[PDB]
Amino acid sequence: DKRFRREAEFLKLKMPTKKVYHISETRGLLKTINSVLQKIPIQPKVAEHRPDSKTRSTIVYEILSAAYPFNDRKLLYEEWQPIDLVRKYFGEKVGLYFAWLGAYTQMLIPASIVGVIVFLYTVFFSVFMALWAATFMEHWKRKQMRLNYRWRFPAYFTNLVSIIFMIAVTFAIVLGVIIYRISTAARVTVTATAVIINLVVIILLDEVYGCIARWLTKIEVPKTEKSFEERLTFKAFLLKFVNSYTPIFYVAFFELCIQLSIIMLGKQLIQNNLFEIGIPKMKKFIRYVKRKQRYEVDFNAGLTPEYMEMIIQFGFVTLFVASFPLAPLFALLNNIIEIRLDAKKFVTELRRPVAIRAKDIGIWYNILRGVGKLAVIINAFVISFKDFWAVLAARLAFVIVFQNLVMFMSDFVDWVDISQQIHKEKVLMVELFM
Amino acid sequence: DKRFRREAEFLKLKMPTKKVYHISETRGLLKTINSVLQKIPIQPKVAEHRPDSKTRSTIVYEILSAAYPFNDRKLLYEEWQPIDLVRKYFGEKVGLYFAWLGAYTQMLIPASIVGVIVFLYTVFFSVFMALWAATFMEHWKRKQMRLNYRWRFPAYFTNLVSIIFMIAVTFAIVLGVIIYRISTAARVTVTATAVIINLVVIILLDEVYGCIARWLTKIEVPKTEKSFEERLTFKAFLLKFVNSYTPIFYVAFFELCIQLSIIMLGKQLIQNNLFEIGIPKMKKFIRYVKRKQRYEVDFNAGLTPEYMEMIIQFGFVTLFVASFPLAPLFALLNNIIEIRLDAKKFVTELRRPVAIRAKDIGIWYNILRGVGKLAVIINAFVISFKDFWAVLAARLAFVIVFQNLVMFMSDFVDWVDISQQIHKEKVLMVELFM
């Protein structure tokens, strides 16, 4: 692993005392910023007392201006399922990211088929769709165990402040859609353009409220780098899910589901893929013996949004699971596509580090559980949506039995291996201990 | 621990080989049935290798016709909160039984106060009552951690058979109430007598369907004595909760809540207390040097129903939590009363054994969680219960927002210590290990 860099020199000598702990390193000088690499077994045996080059620079990070750290990576380049050297090389938490990502593809897999069978020849698609959700959570957890075998008051005042400015942004979005209706007001295509500039403004407000949430999480003085990012993700899916889901919410009570699917595909392709590849050309044209050349390539890395958008994709998977079926299929196309571009995007990365000790997606996981939770009553609530009073009455009745039958089916699924190998493995642990 | 008793003699010698394992015992002969006591430190040190007289006869049971096993018990007799020698003497699982029983009293404690404040001067009692339920589960679990610190197809064919005969008994109860209406048919007091004979018939059908469920669980060939009793309890609360809750269900859709409270108090006093003390007089009049006299007293022990009725008491706590408030207060009187009679009932027991290794009530615990779960929508569903169509419409609307606000408050409570002592305790474990 390497490093970049008066008080920098003196505290650099203070850092060299930490190099004098048990470390072995070297320096490299070019382009008016310092750089220092390192590599060191007996000291790694002391590291083995504290708790395989991935583990090596990993433990170097456990030891610790800027800083950093390929024929097997080229073996990935030909090779890109990928979980073996993906875990061995890319990392564990991101290995879960591509892993449960590919699981999200696997949930996407048989689901679109029955949706095509639906669109051939009506709410049973939504019912068994919710079943597909619960099963997706189910084998998500089961497979999570499988790869687990394969491996003070002013803060709450600011919480109320984020509540108030949050709903202020929400009604601001309501001004986006209502003023969008005024914008297309004075055939369908004027509203299509208003949806185009509207989702463009959503592309604006995503970075706007998003980096605003970076100020919300950055101004919270987070000591730990596990819970601060967690609640930062909580606000992220909060305002972001408000941002995305807000327009379809304006569609529902305040048809245009084709525009919703256009925003789905363009949000997949034109926004995420094309803008994401645009960022590679942004840094690229902004710029535009073996280990020496790779160290030169070092001059040439968040995950949560790349997690969260899949959440948004799951939010794509959930909400309009009410209306139109076929968005799941092309959604799965964007899934496998963004899987491949995710892989090559990881190839394009700025030297992403290791990340150890994680069971699952956690905040994202139970966040998805709650996504199903709000999703059921939500999509039902749109699904039902003189004597017309009694019509809406019967509508509310189907809402009710829809709710009770819905969660009843949810618990019915919730009724649902290698612990035998855990037991005999522990018997072997005492046996080798003997 | 002791024992009672041709092939009995030969297999008795086979048992004496198990006495020749590491055991020390003695025999005693009277009244045409055999009896053998036992007591044995080095062999108990071998028992300490396998995993304090309670632990002694406990491990004797771990070693194993009929069989069995008091100035500290008299110290309980004056002493009867009781958790110290209750755990030390009475046992751990039953110590949880009296423990979370007294916790159920503690939930009963401040709850009746606001109910009196209600009955002075309307659904907010039910709302905060559900809050009292969720908190009851909450500090039930938290206190459970606190005392935790202080310590193939034909079977499913029979499951369908129990379903069919179960609903057959349910409609049979519907014949009980409807034929009870025919019975009082040809002022209110004729219906009071019909309720009297009705609940008497419920007292019949409790033992009837109850021992029928003993045939359901006894004919299931249960190998283990942990899951068979669990599902036996599941059928027990199933048919029993159907039995009790069936009449008020007949009251609701098919006022008489005073008769419901009369069945509550009489079910507490006349049924449970008076019939229970009647069983002591049943065996008593059916019958009607220190260790010698106590061994003579040995000639002179289920728990689940004694658990389950509290469930029924919780089922008393839940359902008519819709209608009338003051049944909680006298219910708490029956709670403290049945706590005392529970204590002296444990004094009256037929030499109850030890029971180790249990975190909590389990089947009963999440059974109570589901009791709240069905309870919320249930009591709401009774609580809302030309243009009268639109009246029931608005009724259904309050049902809906009642449901969403209800579970919303439930999760709001579900947002909610000595693990520090666990950590420093483990630091002391390595330290004493050092």
Author numbering:
A (entry chain A), B (entry chain B): 123 to 127, 167 to 201, 204 to 214, 242 to 254, 278 to 282, 295 to 305, 315 to 355, 409 to 438, ...
The authors write:
TMEM16A is a member of the large TMEM16 family of membrane proteins, also known as anoctamins. Calcium-activated chloride channels (CaCCs) are important constituents of diverse physiological processes, ranging from epithelial chloride secretion to the control of electrical excitability in smooth muscles and neurons. Although it was initially anticipated that all TMEM16 proteins would function as anion channels, it is now generally accepted that only two family members (the closely related TMEM16A and B) are ion channels, whereas most others work as lipid scramblases, which catalyze the passive and bidirectional diffusion of lipids between the two leaflets of a phospholipid bilayer.
In light of the irreversible rundown of TMEM16A-mediated currents observed in patch-clamp experiments at high Ca2+ concentrations, it is at this point ambiguous whether this conformation corresponds to a conducting or a non-conducting state of the channel. The protein shows a similar overall fold and dimeric organization as the lipid scramblase nhTMEM16. The pore region of mTMEM16A, also containing the regulatory calcium-binding site, is formed by transmembrane α-helices 3–8.
